Amino acid sequence: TRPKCGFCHVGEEENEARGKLHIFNAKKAAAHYKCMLFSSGTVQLTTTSRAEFGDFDIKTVLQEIKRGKRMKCTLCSQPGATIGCEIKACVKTYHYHCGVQDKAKYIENMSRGIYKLYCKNHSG
């Protein structure tokens, strides 16, 4: 009944770790803030933070949820793993929490609007 993230398949019980669950339509398409923020195809439109949610192109987020159905996580093997390593040919791709667990590096630059993941092989 209650909504769950279209990426990681969990609802509001993981809001603190994965970011607030946002709901996008009456079919309960939804995503935690970090799950959508780092999704490779999510288009950000204005400055964002956890304190002040920015503007995003929600159509791109819904497209990413759809793509996610095809994307098995590098760590857990379940679908919805749309946070791909930034290095173009790298196959590693994650759910947000799985990337943390598998020692990926998350890069954030709030002023430039840069949010990306580098896997453990591309961490430098």
What is the rounded distance in angstroms from the CA atom of residue 107 to the CA atom of residue 116?
Answer: 5
| Binding of residue 119 to Zn ion (CB under 5 A) | yes
38 φ/ψ angles, rounded to the nearest 5 degrees: -95, -10
Least Cβ distance, residue 83 to Zn ion (angstroms): 9
Rule CB under 5 A: choose which of 22, 33, 35, 93 binds Zn ion: 35
Token pair recorded at residue 30: 């939804």
Segment lying near Zn ion (by CB under 5 A), choices 44-52, 59-67, 94-102, 104-112: 94-102
Q: How many alpha carbons lie under 13 Å from residue 29 in its C-beta half-sphere?
A: 13
CA distance 106 to 85: 10
111 or 116: CB nearest Zn ion: 116
Q: Please give the Cα distance from 30 to 56 (Å, whole number).
A: 13
Question: Should residue 29 be labelled a site residue for Zn ion when binding is judged by CB under 5 A?
Answer: no
Residues that bind Zn ion (CB under 5 A): 5, 7-8, 18, 32, 35, 73, 75-76, 85, 87, 90, 92, 95, 98, 119, 121-122
